[PDB]
Amino acid sequence: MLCEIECRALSTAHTRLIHDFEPRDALTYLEGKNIFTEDHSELISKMSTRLERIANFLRIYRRQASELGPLIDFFNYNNQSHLADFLEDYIDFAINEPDLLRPVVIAPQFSRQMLDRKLLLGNVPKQMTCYIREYHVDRVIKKLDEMCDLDSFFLFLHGRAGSGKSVIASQALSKSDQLIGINYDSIVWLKDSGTAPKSTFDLFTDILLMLKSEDDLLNFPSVEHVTSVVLKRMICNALIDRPNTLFVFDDVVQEETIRWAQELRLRCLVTTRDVEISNAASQTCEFIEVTSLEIDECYDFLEAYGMPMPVGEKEEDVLNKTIELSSGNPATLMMFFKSCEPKTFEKMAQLNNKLESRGLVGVECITPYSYKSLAMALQRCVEVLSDEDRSALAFAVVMPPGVDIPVKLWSCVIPVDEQLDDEVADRLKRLSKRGALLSGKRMPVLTFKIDHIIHMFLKHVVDAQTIANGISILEQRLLEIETVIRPEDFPKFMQLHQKFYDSLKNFACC
């Protein structure tokens, strides 16, 4: 049988095996060197079109031969030597001189019109254009380049909901011309979003079908009912004809996906919100986190789509209000723009009001996002959560948002089934790891923080009672004996943050 390299050669040189070649010419020359059978030759000799005899010749060949010899020793004799020279060139720039393969025998045939074909057939989404986050898309392309050599690997492009990961992945497979063609031959991009236990099987059913030829999509059997070992075997079967194939698994929630990805020795890019799914894999795992949009980048994004830049001081302030509120978040920022109707800074501050007195539902809009509002997204992130973590999260409302505060200051509102409350930290960590709902910050002192988007989510969403109960449950422990953290001589008075507390009490008197 061959392998991924010799088949990468047979795959790269396919435009050519289509432009000048014929399997009838080779069947006779090949029954001799022992690489066929009279049914193999039966199947390939009587076929109406040539692309049929070719697809059967390259499939049967990729399975039957002990090596890629008796196919160099043929394009030669048949005056189609212009083929066997290309393939021997590739195998030589593969066994003897490595590295040189990407610059020399693979790149001089790139074409920005073949890419779009390959992207489209691999279901890659149409990269964003009016703004590109340089840094991230770049480091993705980089870390993908570093691994095309590797046999199987996970790249985790993880972030908040609406934090912009998938779009960045769309751009990373659309920016370079290297990743598809030079570093990897093909792309298969499949969206997961599986919650049920049958989802993790159906996905790889649609992988199996993302792989399969336009022929025998007709023949698809009642595979809906067929064991996992068989769908898996069917894939690693049909996966031979697929040398260096990249897999994007957009929006993974279940680590069972990742386990299949790791049993199937697949090459995977992965966008997800819960980062801990990587513990499922005992392997080369590499990570890229999509942080919240920095204050300057938000400017960049707005200018990028035609938004008028400030002059008066309370206009740059209006936009810092927006950037603060939507605590650096692509999606709600976009909804924000889409809903700014007249375009005035005025109606933008109108919305800035609307966000505090109606939550995300005040700016929910039709956006390139599948979601009307970021709350629909965070929804799932909150359902999946460990029941206890669901509790911790449910209580983190009654904090100050966009304020760095100690663990003990959290131990007061946060639940627990003695004298050391570190368990709070463990939960709040799980909480930031799994949808980036919190925010961990090791020194000066162990402190977490809840952002603003992630707060106004909870505001108009948690049980109206639990707010006032958390506020009182806070005012209890509250007594016993700026770019600066609140000191331990002064925890007894949270009154510093009275503003954002007078607001929840006014909220809970309605």
Binding site: M376, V382, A394, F457
Partner: peptide, 7 residues
């Protein structure tokens, strides 16, 4: 009620 239908 502990979460207005999760959100």
């Amino acid at each position: 009620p502990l979460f207005n239908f999760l959100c």
